Design a protein around this ligand. Sequence first.
Ligand SMILES: [Zn+2]
Ligand SMILES: [Zn+2]
Length: 246
Amino acid sequence: PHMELHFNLELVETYKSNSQKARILTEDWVYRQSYCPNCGNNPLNHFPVADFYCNHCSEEFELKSKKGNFSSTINDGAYATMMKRVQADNNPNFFFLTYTKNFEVNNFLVLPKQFVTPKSIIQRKPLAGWIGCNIDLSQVPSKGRIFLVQDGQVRDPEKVTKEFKQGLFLRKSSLSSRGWTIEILNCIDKIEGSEFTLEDMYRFESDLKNIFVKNNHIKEKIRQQLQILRDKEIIEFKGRGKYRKL
DNA sequence: CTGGATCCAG
DNA sequence: CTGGATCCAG
Ligand SMILES: [Zn+2]
Ligand SMILES: [Zn+2]
């Protein structure tokens, strides 16, 4: 098994000046080159929409693509529609593909569906109406941005599948309880290095209070959330309010 | 006390 | 059943 990072260069020539070129090329690449980031199965199945599923584990993936520079936002459709889906916990997993002017994939990631929170949905050039949206990847923790290819480097599929499976417990939490765990992961991402203290986490109290406005016991909530993450092997407790990222 | 463990009103 | 609240060991 060898991933080829370039698109089909013959299709590049055939579909020159064709309106659908960029969709044909990206879908083709995902179909032949991607694997299921849950169970590792290759190839995926095709379901207009660029939707795939895994015939082994039934995971679904919808593809989004951007030519050029890696963006911290993924273009979607309507704000209201995306919201209904997010609320109903109904989104597919998302594949995000970025590619160069020479039709090489330089980033390819999966955003597992449960990491798409109301918060991560931002309005695009909003107008009083007409309001598109993006998914804002700066609001998604590293645990929910799982790279199959990163900066032109093909990652170990065993690490991809491990990371994907590690986050699946969040599918069993309801919206706000899931939101808590996801925001704690966002805090931990900001801590520089491997080691951190409870004191480090308490610095985010003000930030967390602004998201979770009804919580008057934020320090205690932080402790509980750290315990959930320990139980899920995402951090370890070294005792006495000291932790290490895993 | 500090911080890991558990709970319950609506 | 949830997520803000309370319990409880060292
Ligand atoms: Zn190539
Ligand atoms: Zn699969």
